Design a protein around this ligand. Structure first.
Ligand code: HEM
Ligand code: HEM
Ligand SMILES: Cc1cc(N)nc2cc(CNCCc3ccc(C#N)cc3)ccc12
Ligand SMILES: Cc1cc(N)nc2cc(CNCCc3ccc(C#N)cc3)ccc12
Ligand SMILES: C[C@H](O)[C@H](O)[C@H]1CNc2nc(N)[nH]c(=O)c2N1
Ligand SMILES: C[C@H](O)[C@H](O)[C@H]1CNc2nc(N)[nH]c(=O)c2N1
Ligand SMILES: [Zn+2]
Lengths: 405, 404
């Protein structure tokens, strides 16, 4: 009936219509002819004004003062600013509204039922690579909260016309090193080879563990990146052990407790925040399945499989499956033991169902990227597998951005 | 420009320029992506222009475009359409179409096999009665005593101002689902509607968890007649776990032939509303979906209780654990009974070569990423890390409304 996407859940037979996507005024990667939905990365005062106006509108609507004289005065104030400085500034609580919106608007995040509880740290005053380090340390301390993790974000100055961006070069605040070996292999995390090399070029004296935390490479505007090392006590880690296979502890596997992305642009009302790191806490398959078992990461599947005594000779033993499950069980049980916040793929996807059900009533939809929302193990076994999803770009958004170098 | 496709496990990059040949539209626009939707939302030289293409496709396939045989065939088709508003395909053209329709189905992980397909021309069918005979034969050939074989049977095309040949059942083999007034459901919940359609057309229902349903066959503009499969055509496998003794006690079992009745074959503009096709199972279809899906047989918890696992909390991964034991029992049983089957690992590996062959022959391969990745152990298989482009090529297998 309705001229909007029909959306069906096949477990339950229930149907919904996404009316929110009518607000998506950025084009994604698909067209009538080809669907590029599996792609990870597909690729003026005039222009700013219209975005700004749309954000202020979103904001005043969020506090139910739409069309009020507060609202229409703010708007005038902004055009005034864009008029003389070619840009405009945000208010504290605007900023906070946007930072939560970009989280809420983020299609690849199963964790969004929490989008409301986000501590936003204003660092728009920060003026040095030194001070960035200080802000970042505060964040890590706060978000970690001794293993009782608290989602948070820290926002450094926005892009100014004709001036260097605040940029953090590492992809995450915590990243194990990747050491290109003499024989050709990589010691540690192969995902992090290039940054590991860059720290080195910039002065890092490098270890040779599998699990060496990298220093940060913080860049203030128009200045060469500066190297900062994290105090080992600030970086909580969890040693991985298994609840019934006593040998698993012997593999010496560790993961860090805090997932903190630091290379993503945060966009609000057309304002671009190039340094704006945020943190939540892990879903257990991020560690157990992708980070530890991906062919092109630590690739520890055959190794566990062999200790397990499995038939790694043939696919049909499902030796890969048995191994990956027990590795995931180990990530779960270890974090639990350590009193570090962790959520399994079942419980996370159940909560996302509730989120969808929530956002249905609240906005008439929730933009979602099915491929990224369905766990990388036991897909069919989680509710979101059977849940059709519409994906579109809403703003404020978290965007990808070129590596500074 | 043209889509840039990357493998995130190897670092390789391809370019799908075969997508440039899609002339059907998909559910997506630039503002919204509806790739995850299971179904869509639902004059005469358009037909001709579909036929002219297919004929060119066919003659280019056998290395003879522009030639005489091509030229004439083009005009044959033109003339038959101009005078009758439709036309017909010669059997070798049909066999080609049917094989392309398999090759182009973006949801199939098994297309490494696409050249090896037995085509039965059954367009000289004029009754429910004949339909049944053609189907009984499909099964015996395709089943092939458990050494399974890919086959399609093509019943007469749709025709303007006449009803359609239809097979009402979703698959030639399905288990009856009886809704018991207790809210609950005996058998396969996915099959309740068709079970009742069967009952009401005078089928004598059983009350087992795995009751093989009869076939409702419908020749044009007549009521569907009801035929019963001879038990020795329905090859079934009992499930049993290679190390868990107690598993065979579960009385589980699944048929061997996955054959689909309700889809529509489209070739050069012609539509075939009855054209069932079969292959062999991939183990996860049975082990994960059909037995563990909450809305199917849903045996996840029972098995888990039998494994003495911890139902109490999700974080013991009991769901995951039980599932893997199930998929194993399906791989065990089938391999023990010498019934063709393939595990999800073996399957996606072959698909990767298929992707590579396709990239070299046509410059691409239409793939539905969400359907290619198995229902367990996603990233544990190489297709997870492979970007895919999706689009509708013709010939094509399509969905179509149930005939009621
Ligand atoms: C609080 C618990 C959270 C959980 C369990 C969670 C879970 C996840 C997971 C599992 C992914 C996919 C990761 C991958 O495979 O790369 C993801 C992606 C994402 N999350 Fe969340 N998240 C949480 C908090 C947050 C917060 C606080 C924010 C923003 C302030 C956020 C923003 C995002 C974004 C933008 C992505 C997309 C990643 C990308 O585009 O590369 N998440 N999240
Ligand atoms: C020979 C071994 C084969 C294997 C292992 C295989 C595997 C699969 C799998 C796993 C699916 C996903 C279906 C689902 O999850 O429900 C699928 C779908 C599909 N396959 Fe294959 N297949 C095989 C043969 C064939 C043949 C012979 C044809 C056609 C002649 C075919 C065409 C299709 C089509 C059209 C779909 C989409 C089904 C739908 O939309 O419901 N495949 N196949
Ligand atoms: C807040 C957050 C929480 C959480 N639990 N997990 C989180 C995981 C991420 C991980 N996103 C990175 C995934 C990726 C994207 C692009 C490319 C490339 N090229 C390589 C990898 C980000 C934020 C997270
Ligand atoms: C050739 C073939 C081979 C094989 N191994 N498995 C195969 C499985 C199928 C199963 N497709 C059914 C999936 C579906 C589609 C639409 C709706 C609806 N509405 C509900 C379920 C078809 C063909 C197969
Ligand atoms: C090619 C494909 O998009 C890629 O492997 C995706 C698949 N799904 C994913 N899902 C999540 N959550 N994170 C990922 O990095 C990916 N990678
Ligand atoms: C909603 C979701 O797209 C739907 O359940 C899909 C997901 N992927 C699938 N993949 C396969 N192979 N078969 C399916 O039936 C489905 N179902
Ligand atoms: Zn799409």
């Amino acid at each position: 009936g309705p001229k909007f996407p029909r959306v069906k859940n096949w477990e339950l037979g229930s149907i919904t219509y996404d009316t929110l996507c009518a607000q998506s005024q950025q084009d994604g990667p698909c067209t009538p002819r080809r669907c590029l939905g599996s792609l990870v990365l597909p690729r003026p005062a005039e222009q700013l004004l219209s975005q700004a106006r749309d954000f202020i509108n979103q904001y005043y609507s969020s506090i139910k003062r739409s069309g009020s004289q507060a609202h229409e005065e703010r708007l005038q104030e902004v055009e005034a600013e864009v008029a003389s400085t070619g840009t405009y500034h945000l208010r504290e609580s605007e900023l906070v509204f946007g930072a939560k919106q970009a989280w809420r608007n983020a299609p690849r995040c199963v964790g969004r039922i929490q989008w409301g509880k986000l501590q936003v740290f204003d660092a728009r005053d920060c003026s040095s690579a030194q001070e960035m380090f200080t802000y970042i340390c505060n964040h890590i301390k706060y978000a970690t909260n001794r293993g009782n993790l608290r989602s948070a974000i820290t926002v450094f100055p926005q892009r100014a016309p004709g001036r260097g961006d605040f940029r953090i070069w590492n992809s995450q605040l915590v990243r194990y090193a990747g050491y290109r070996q003499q024989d050709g292999s990589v010691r540690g995390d192969p995902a992090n080879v290039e940054i590991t090399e860059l720290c080195i070029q910039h002065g890092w004296t490098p270890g040779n563990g599998r699990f060496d935390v990298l220093p940060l490479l913080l860049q203030a505007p128009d200045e060469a990146p500066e190297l900062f090392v994290l105090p080992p006590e600030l970086v909580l880690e969890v040693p991985l052990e298994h609840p019934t296979l006593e040998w698993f502890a012997a593999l010496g596997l560790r993961w860090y407790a805090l997932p903190a992305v630091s290379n993503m642009l945060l966009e609000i009302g057309g304002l671009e925040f190039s340094a704006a790191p945020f943190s939540g806490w892990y879903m257990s398959t991020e560690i157990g399945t992708r980070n530890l078992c991906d062919p092109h990461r630590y690739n520890i599947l055959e190794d566990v499989a062999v200790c397990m005594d499995l038939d790694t000779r043939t696919t049909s033993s499902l030796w890969k499956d048995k191994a990956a499950v027990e590795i995931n069980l180990a990530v779960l049980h270890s974090f639990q033991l350590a009193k570090v916040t962790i959520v399994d793929h079942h419980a996370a996807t159940v909560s996302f169902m509730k989120h969808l059900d929530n956002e249905q009533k609240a906005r008439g939809g929730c933009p979602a990227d099915w491929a990224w929302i369905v766990p990388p193990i036991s897909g069919s076994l989680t509710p979101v597998f059977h849940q059709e999803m519409v994906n579109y770009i809403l703003s404020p958004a978290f965007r990808y951005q070129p590596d500074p170098w």
